[PDB]
Amino acid sequence: RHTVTMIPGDGIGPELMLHVKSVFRHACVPVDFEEVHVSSNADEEDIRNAIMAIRRNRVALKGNIETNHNLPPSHKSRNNILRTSLDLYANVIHCKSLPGVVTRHKDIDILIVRENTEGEYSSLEHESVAGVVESLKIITKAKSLRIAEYAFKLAQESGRKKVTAVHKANIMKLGDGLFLQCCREVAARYPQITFENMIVDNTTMQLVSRPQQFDVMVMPNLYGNIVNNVCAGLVGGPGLVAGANYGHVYAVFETATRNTGKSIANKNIANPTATLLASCMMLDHLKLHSYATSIRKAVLASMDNENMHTPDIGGQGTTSEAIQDVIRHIRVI
Amino acid sequence: VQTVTLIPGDGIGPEISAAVMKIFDAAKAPIQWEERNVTAIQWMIPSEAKESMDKNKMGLKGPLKTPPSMNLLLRKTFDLYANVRPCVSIEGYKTPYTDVNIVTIRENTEGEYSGIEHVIVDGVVQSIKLITEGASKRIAEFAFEYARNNHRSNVTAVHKANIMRMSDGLFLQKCREVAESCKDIKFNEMYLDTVCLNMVQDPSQFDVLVMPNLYGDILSDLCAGLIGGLGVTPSGNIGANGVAIFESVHGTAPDIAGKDMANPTALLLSAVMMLRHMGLFDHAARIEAACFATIKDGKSLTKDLGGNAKCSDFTEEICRRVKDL
Ligand SMILES: Nc1ncnc2c1ncn2[C@@H]1O[C@H](COP(=O)(O)OP(=O)(O)O)[C@@H](O)[C@H]1O
Numbered sequence: 001r002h003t004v005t006m007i008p009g010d011g012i013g014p015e016l017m018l019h020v021k022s023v024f025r026h027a028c029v030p031v032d033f034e035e036v037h038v039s040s041n042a043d044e045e046d047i048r049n050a051i052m053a054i055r056r057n058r059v060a061l062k063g064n065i066e067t068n069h070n071l072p073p074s075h076k077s078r079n080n081i082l083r084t085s086l087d088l089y090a091n092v093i094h095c096k097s098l099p100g101v102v103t104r105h106k107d108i109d110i111l112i113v114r115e116n117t118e119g120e121y122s123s124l125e126h127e128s129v130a131g132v133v134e135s136l137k138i139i140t141k142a143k144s145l146r147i148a149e150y151a152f153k154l155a156q157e158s159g160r161k162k163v164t165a166v167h168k169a170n171i172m173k174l175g176d177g178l179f180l181q182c183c184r185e186v187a188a189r190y191p192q193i194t195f196e197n198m199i200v201d202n203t204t205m206q207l208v209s210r211p212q213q214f215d216v217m218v219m220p221n222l223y224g225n226i227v228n229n230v231c232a233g234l235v236g237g238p239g240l241v242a243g244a245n246y247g248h249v250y251a252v253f254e255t256a257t258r259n260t261g262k263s264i265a266n267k268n269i270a271n272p273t274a275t276l277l278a279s280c281m282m283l284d285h286l287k288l289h290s291y292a293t294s295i296r297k298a299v300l301a302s303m304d305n306e307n308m309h310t311p312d313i314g315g316q317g318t319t320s321e322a323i324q325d326v327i328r329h330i331r332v333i
Numbered sequence: 334v335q336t337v338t339l340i341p342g343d344g345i346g347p348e349i350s351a352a353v354m355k356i357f358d359a360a361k362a363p364i365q366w367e368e369r370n371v372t373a374i375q376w377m378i379p380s381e382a383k384e385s386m387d388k389n390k391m392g393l394k395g396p397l398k399t400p401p402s403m404n405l406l407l408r409k410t411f412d413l414y415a416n417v418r419p420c421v422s423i424e425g426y427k428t429p430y431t432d433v434n435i436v437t438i439r440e441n442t443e444g445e446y447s448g449i450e451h452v453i454v455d456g457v458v459q460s461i462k463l464i465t466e467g468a469s470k471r472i473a474e475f476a477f478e479y480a481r482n483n484h485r486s487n488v489t490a491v492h493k494a495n496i497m498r499m500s501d502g503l504f505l506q507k508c509r510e511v512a513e514s515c516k517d518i519k520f521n522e523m524y525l526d527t528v529c530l531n532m533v534q535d536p537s538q539f540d541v542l543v544m545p546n547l548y549g550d551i552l553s554d555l556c557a558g559l560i561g562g563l564g565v566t567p568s569g570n571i572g573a574n575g576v577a578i579f580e581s582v583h584g585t586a587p588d589i590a591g592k593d594m595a596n597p598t599a600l601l602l603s604a605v606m607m608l609r610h611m612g613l614f615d616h617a618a619r620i621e622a623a624c625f626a627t628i629k630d631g632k633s634l635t636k637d638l639g640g641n642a643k644c645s646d647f648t649e650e651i652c653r654r655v656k657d658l
Pocket residue numbers: 011012064238239258259260261262263264269270271272274312524527
């Protein structure tokens with residue numbers, strides 16, 4: 001019996017956590033959820049508490065915390081505060097075409113490894129004179145090496161052939177330059193893995209026309225945000241793909257695209273697939289593989305029946321109908 | 334009769350510039366060309382080609398071989414602050430996206446192309462993203478003016494003010510301020526990751542997009558990929574003193590540089606864009622319609638668009654079709 005931190009988050013986060021728990025009880029999952037909430041206040045009490053809870057349990061499942069960008073710079077993203085403080089350096093998502101979800105592209109199977117702690121997300125800005133703002137993108141050798149190390153290790157453990165570094169080192173020559181250097185330094189230790197690089201501009205252009213060429217992709221923080229979203233979209237959108245945040249000692253599971261879903265909150269139409277799949281990845285990490293594969297099979301099977309599809313993938317079904325259908329593939333195991 | 338300074342550029346450039354001029358002549362366009370050459374002298378463009386553009390206020394540019402980048406200089410020389418990219422699905426050239434009708438409006442002076450980086454210590458690098466009141470205001474007013482003048486209804490500011498609160502929030506604040514003045518254009522704001530997310534799913538939900546330098550650099554190529562690539566995509570840089578340079582953004586293509594095979598579409602469509610900027614709507618339309626019909630017919634498609642015909646043939650058919658008005 002494991003104790004896991006659960007941050008419900010905002011928008012559709014709370015309602016989906018409820019379905020997660022329902023599914024967990026019905027599958028007899030030996031996991032207790034220890035809920036911690038993160039409000040809207042500029043006061044960082046809630047967020048530091050959440051961080052401390054994850055330090056004990058070392059594993060969390062969270063919804064997306066709203067960041068109000070009309071607030072002052074000192075009020076920072078709680079999502080970002082969290083993963084930077086816990087040093088969850090690796091953000092990994094797996095975008096794979098779902099045979100039941102027909103889109104404009106097929107045979108997409110891409111692993112995206114995104115640097116999760118520095119780059120454009122360092123929250124370093126200032127106003128030297130009135131109306132002249134500088135923001136400071138930070139690229140380091142230590143963090144670039146570990147992200148690259150993680151990307152190559154994953155590729156060879158998964159039986160995958162190619163790692164593509166995406167960057168803009170033709171413009172940010174020193175910054176993105178160093179990131180490349182660190183990827184190359186790691187590449188030397190993996191002669192079996194084909195290493196390529198590609199400019200983020202070209203990468204997106206390639207993704208919308210021939211995304212099948214990509215196998216494993218490693219990149220700095222912002223470009224990760226971009227590529228993750230393009231890739232989720234190609235396979236059918238934000239309700240489908242799960243997302244992991246790994247540190248050396250901690251792991252936090254969430255939906256790939258990190259969407260609050262405020263505009264569809266409480267209307268029983270949120271797609272549950274992404275969150276369920278995140279919760280399975282968490283089970284696999286907690287070494288509860290039997291329960292993972294059991295829940296994973298049900299949600300992937302519910303995906304085949306196009307009658308159980310929510311609006312974000314063309315269907316008209318509700319969240320609760322999908323949960324029923326998932327719970328039903330479980331109670332027949 | 335109006336004068337445009339023509340920069341034929343490199344590799345396949347001279348060819349496709351020759352193709353455009355020829356088609357323009359076939360259309361009886363009120364345009365004569367003032368051929369110049371830009372090569373960095375020891376760093377600035379030749380003295381006698383700057384004055385040429387200062388004179389004409391209006392220029393057309395082929396693909397340029399790079400290393401000091403020639404585009405950086407031209408940008409700085411003429412203060413070309415707005416990069417404009419209309420992406421529209423080509424009926425003769427099917428991609429998985431058939432309903433794309435988008436204009437990306439890119440701030441082209443500052444943002445993350447500040448030029449400034451430092452090695453803080455060994456293995457720790459800082460790249461400065463720079464955002465100012467004036468440049469952000471300038472680009473916002475351009476985007477709304479463009480919206481109005483080109484029969485456009487929605488403008489979306491694309492940002493990450495959630496993550497980059499001071500810089501992007503400032504950019505966003507100037508867009509919001511301009512929006513209040515131009516109430517006849519509908520304004521909304523969207524996170525960059527959400528724009529990408531929706532763009533690859535349903536491009537039709539967007540109209541005009543305004544954004545800082547790196548985002549628009551990236552997003553403009555994304556949009557190009559929706560409609561068939563860089564070889565078919567028009568682009569214009571609008572600057573200070575009413576100056577504008579329209580350009581092809583594809584490669585130099587040295588492999589086929591003088592062996593025909595080159596595709597003039599993108600430049601021609603930039604030249605059509607130029608024409609519309611000049612008020613020559615009738616000529617723009619005819620050349621555009623001609624180009625389109627040629628592509629749709631699909632007889633004289635160049636090797637990149639899947640055909641077998643050479644540049645000469647493709648140009649000839651456009652010329653032939655334009656003459657029928
Ligand atoms: N699980 C989901 N099911 C259906 N639509 C979703 C889901 N998650 C996100 N979306 C949609 O994806 C879009 C972007 O999400 P959004 O709520 O704007 O994220 P954020 O507030 O973090 O920027 C929205 O249209 C949202 O309704």
